[PDB]
Amino acid sequence: SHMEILWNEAKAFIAECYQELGKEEEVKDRLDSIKSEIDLTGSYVHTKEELEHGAKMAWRNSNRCIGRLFWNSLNVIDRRDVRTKEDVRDALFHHIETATNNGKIRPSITIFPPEEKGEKQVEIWNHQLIRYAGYEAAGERIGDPASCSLTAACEQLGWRGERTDFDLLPLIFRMKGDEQPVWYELPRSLVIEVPITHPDIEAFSDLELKWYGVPIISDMKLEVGGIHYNAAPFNGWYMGTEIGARNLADEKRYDKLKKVASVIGISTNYNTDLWKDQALVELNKAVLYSYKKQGVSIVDHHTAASQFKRFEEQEEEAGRKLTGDWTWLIPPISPAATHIFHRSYDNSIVKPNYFYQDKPYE
Amino acid sequence: SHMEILWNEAKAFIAECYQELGKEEEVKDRLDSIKSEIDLTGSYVHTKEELEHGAKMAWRNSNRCIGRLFWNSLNVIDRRDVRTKEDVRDALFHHIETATNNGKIRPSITIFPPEEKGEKQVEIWNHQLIRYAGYEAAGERIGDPASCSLTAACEQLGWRGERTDFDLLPLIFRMKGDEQPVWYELPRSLVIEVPITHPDIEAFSDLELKWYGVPIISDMKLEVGGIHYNAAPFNGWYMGTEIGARNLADEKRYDKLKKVASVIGISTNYNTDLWKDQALVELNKAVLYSYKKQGVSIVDHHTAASQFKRFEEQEEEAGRKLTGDWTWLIPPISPAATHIFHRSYDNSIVKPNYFYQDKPYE
Numbered sequence: 144s145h146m147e148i149l150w151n152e153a154k155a156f157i158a159e160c161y162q163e164l165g166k167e168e169e170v171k172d173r174l175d176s177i178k179s180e181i182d183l184t185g186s187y188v189h190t191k192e193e194l195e196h197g198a199k200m201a202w203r204n205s206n207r208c209i210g211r212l213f214w215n216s217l218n219v220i221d222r223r224d225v226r227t228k229e230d231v232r233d234a235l236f237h238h239i240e241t242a243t244n245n246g247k248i249r250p251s252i253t254i255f256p257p258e259e260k261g262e263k264q265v266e267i268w269n270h271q272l273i274r275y276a277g278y279e280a281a282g283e284r285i286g287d288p289a290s291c292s293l294t295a296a297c298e299q300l301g302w303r304g305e306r307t308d309f310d311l312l313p314l315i316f317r318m319k320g321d322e323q324p325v326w327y328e329l330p331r332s333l334v335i336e337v338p339i340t341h342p343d344i345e346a347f348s349d350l351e352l353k354w355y356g357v358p359i360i361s362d363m364k365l366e367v368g369g370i371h372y373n374a375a376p377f378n379g380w381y382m383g384t385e386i387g388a389r390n391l392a393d394e395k396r397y398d399k400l401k402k403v404a405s406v407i408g409i410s411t412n413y414n415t416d417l418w419k420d421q422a423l424v425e426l427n428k429a430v431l432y433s434y435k436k437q438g439v440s441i442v443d444h445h446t447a448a449s450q451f452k453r454f455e456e457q458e459e460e461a462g463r464k465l466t467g468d469w470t471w472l473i474p475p476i477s478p479a480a481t482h483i484f485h486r487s488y489d490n491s492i493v494k495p496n497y498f499y500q501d502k503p504y505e
Numbered sequence: 506s507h508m509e510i511l512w513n514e515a516k517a518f519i520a521e522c523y524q525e526l527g528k529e530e531e532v533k534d535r536l537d538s539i540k541s542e543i544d545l546t547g548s549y550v551h552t553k554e555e556l557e558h559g560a561k562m563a564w565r566n567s568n569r570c571i572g573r574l575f576w577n578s579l580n581v582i583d584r585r586d587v588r589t590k591e592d593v594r595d596a597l598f599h600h601i602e603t604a605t606n607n608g609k610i611r612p613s614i615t616i617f618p619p620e621e622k623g624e625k626q627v628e629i630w631n632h633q634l635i636r637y638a639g640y641e642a643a644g645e646r647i648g649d650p651a652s653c654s655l656t657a658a659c660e661q662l663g664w665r666g667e668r669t670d671f672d673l674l675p676l677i678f679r680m681k682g683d684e685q686p687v688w689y690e691l692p693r694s695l696v697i698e699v700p701i702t703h704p705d706i707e708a709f710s711d712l713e714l715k716w717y718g719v720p721i722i723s724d725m726k727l728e729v730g731g732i733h734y735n736a737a738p739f740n741g742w743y744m745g746t747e748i749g750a751r752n753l754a755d756e757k758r759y760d761k762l763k764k765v766a767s768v769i770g771i772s773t774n775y776n777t778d779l780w781k782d783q784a785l786v787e788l789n790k791a792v793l794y795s796y797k798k799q800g801v802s803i804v805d806h807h808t809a810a811s812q813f814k815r816f817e818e819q820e821e822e823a824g825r826k827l828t829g830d831w832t833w834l835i836p837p838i839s840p841a842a843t844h845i846f847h848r849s850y851d852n853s854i855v856k857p858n859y860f861y862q863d864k865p866y867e
């Protein structure tokens with residue numbers, strides 16, 4: 144039944160892809176080759192043009208992403224030639240270096256070899272290539288609680304952290320033919336970090352906060368024409384609220400709102416004073432100012448929504464339908480001040496797209 | 506087919522209602538009487554206990570309401586005896602007076618006669634009993650844009666406003682047997698209004714803002730045991746954000762954020778400064794402070810979410826399932842700071858409940 148499903152999805156992808164590219168003539172021929180290949184091996188190999196355009200279409204169909212206006216400018220890195228653990232490590236080191244680009248971040252994706260008979264060639268365990276560790280001793284919390292389970296798995300393999308609130312996790316992945324994964328500590332020269340300060344309030348630095356510069360999701364599956372690429376890291380640039388309103392504010396994460404209120408000089412006695420709302424405004428203002436000072440790319444939520452509006456218009460103009468998830472598109476601060484809040488979206492799934500997959504650990 | 510549907514809904518309501526009331530014995534008898542009544546007239550008459558408990562259950566099932574913790578304390582006013590236009594006017598005047606209660610607002614509902622053969626006995630045109638008019642001359646906007654259509658209909662009947670930003674609309678309703686509705690100007694002694702000032706910034710009064718004290722939704726249909734009460738006004742008390750983050754902030758309503766930014770001393774040049782988020786915080790703080798000073802009931806969003814949490818727990822403890830609409834339950838300011846944001850809800854419809862109905866005007 145797997146051979147049937149593969150053929151269906153290949154028929155729809157080739158036609159739609161070559162149509163957008165203006166190569167409708169070649170559709171008839173290529174399909175005959177893919178068909179013969181499927182009967183011969185049980186799968187097919189995408190051309191460079193096909194995989195490159197496929198990863199772009201997948202971003203365009205991501206219902207939960209507010210940055211879809213820049214979909215056609217994605218930088219695609221083809222690494223389907225990797226065979227060893229050293230090959231993977233160097234490619235991952237290269238992704239961080241080129242995407243960072245000394246601060247002027249470049250949206251990118253690295254393509255590793257896909258699954259064969261459902262079996263993987265390379266399996267990445269990290270959620271993001273750069274992330275902080277999390278420990279929960281009987282005493283209290285240290286680090287990022289969302290990293291608990293992955294942190295425990297790394298220490299079960301010989302790794303050991305320093306136990307500060309910001310320990311960098313190591314790269315951890317498994318090669319086909321091995322029962323357990325291998326790990327490599329990240330070189331400090333490759334990772335940019337940004338200390339958090341405030342434009343007018345000098346005491347803000349007493350909190351000693353900081354965050355990393357580039358978010359690189361590395362545990363999702365990219366599906367193109369029936370072919371499953373379980374390993375394919377991708378990155379864009381941060382939207383301010385992700386850090387100041389969630390990562391540092393959530394009670395289940397760093398939980399910093401009370402401390403913020405203290406350094407800015409306001410009381411935390413009464414809810415009618417709305418101290419939580421005021422603390423959120425100063426913290427978020429601090430995140431945008433600090434990233435800009437050091438020259439690292441970032442975007443505020445009002446500018447972001449404005450760009451997404453232009454995206455909706457372009458899609459209508461091109462003749463394509465729009466899909467999206469309202470519950471993820473609205474910003475976590477001042478949502479009613481953007482256009483997104485005042486309209487509705489169709490949350491249907493269209494392929495090619497990016498998908499969630501089960502975690503090896505846990 | 507209408508006689509069939511009525512019987513079904515009556516069977517489920519009586520059993521469920523008498524069960525909660527601990528009168529399961531009387532279920533067998535009452536059902537036999539209702540059945541005979543339906544064959545005789547084509548409808549049935551609720552007892553005082555049945556209608557009172559029915560309006561309470563309906564509030565408990567309202568997916569979009571965050572104030573459901575106080576459902577069992579609702580004040581029910583039975584006015585199914587009205588026959589003339591003067592009878593309706595006095596009852597509506599009485600609802601505003603008793604619900605206001607000199608500031609200590611009392612959640613209430615007034616029950617008018619229900620529909621017969623789909624035909625209404627009394628039809629209310631107002632959206633809320635107390636609301637401001639809206640005009641849109643070629644010059645610009647004056648008043649509340651959301652009141653445009655209803656305002657035009659009132660002037661088509663002989664009414665005339667003064668054209669300020671806060672003209673009070675008149676009560677307007679139609680009696681069975683008349684082709685057009687009648688109107689009555691509201692007595693100023695019955696309507697409480699609150700001027701908006703700021704606790705620390707004295708220049709805030711230069712904006713000359715104000716809003717009314719009690720929101721009374723009067724155009725929804727209450728359905729209990731197959732019986733349709735198209736006319737049944739109800740009220741609770743305001744949640745701060747409804748006024749400061751929507752009524753006075755939306756670009757399609759009063760659109761005041763830029764003016765607010767001016768009186769507090771901040772610039773509106775750059776989105777990275779987050780001036781819209783800061784203006785929203787001071788305006789909302791002003792609304793809570795002003796209502797309290799004058800002694801009128803109001804609640805902030807953090808306290809409100811906290812109360813709703815206790816509601817979820819009580820429902821679980823009583824053995825009933827929970828239903829709700831996430832998109833309406835989350836507050837329009839700092840949503841990620843409340844528990845509601847971090848969970849999911851089942852948006853199924855359970856009866857008895859309140860429903861939308863077509864507008865006579867427009």
Ligand code: HEM
Binds near residue numbers: 202213250251252380
């Ligand atoms: C160029 C700048 C980019 C910005 C400004 C941006 C911003 C966002 C934001 C705000 C979210 C929500 C994250 C959260 O709440 O945790 C998101 C989700 C997502 N974005 Fe982007 N993104 C960018 C680039 C990309 C790229 C390059 C891709 C893919 C090639 C992409 C695919 C998606 C997908 C699938 C999600 C959902 C993730 C999940 O379900 O956990 N985005 N993006």
Ligand code: HEM
Binds near residue numbers: 612
């Ligand atoms: C006692 C205090 C009350 C508070 C604090 C409260 C608060 C709220 C809020 C914030 C909304 C959203 C309004 C909007 O976004 O426009 C709402 C909606 C609603 N509430 Fe309440 N409410 C109260 C009492 C009541 C009462 C007394 C009833 C019914 C007997 C009720 C029935 C509902 C319903 C059906 C909606 C949806 C209205 C719509 O769809 O337009 N609430 N309530």
Ligand SMILES: C[C@H](O)[C@H](O)C1=Nc2c(nc(N)[nH]c2=O)NC1
Binds near residue numbers: 470
């Ligand atoms: C996770 C669950 O679906 C829940 O709706 C939310 N979390 C998030 C959210 N929105 C964003 N962007 N990110 C989240 O983590 N909204 C909803």
Ligand SMILES: C[C@H](O)[C@H](O)C1=Nc2c(nc(N)[nH]c2=O)NC1
Binds near residue numbers: 484833
């Ligand atoms: C009206 C439409 O359903 C849209 O989701 C919204 N308006 C509102 C909303 N939330 C509230 N409480 N009130 C609204 O007017 N969220 C959604």
Ligand SMILES: N=C(NO)NCCC[C@H](N)C(=O)O
Binds near residue numbers: 379380381386
């Ligand atoms: N802005 C982007 N992608 O470019 N974001 C991805 C998800 C990141 C996650 N919200 C974090 O704070 O780490």
Ligand SMILES: N=C(NO)NCCC[C@H](N)C(=O)O
Binds near residue numbers: 740741743747752
């Ligand atoms: N808080 C309550 N009901 O008690 N609200 C009802 C809806 C009111 C509407 N949001 C307004 O601002 O007028």
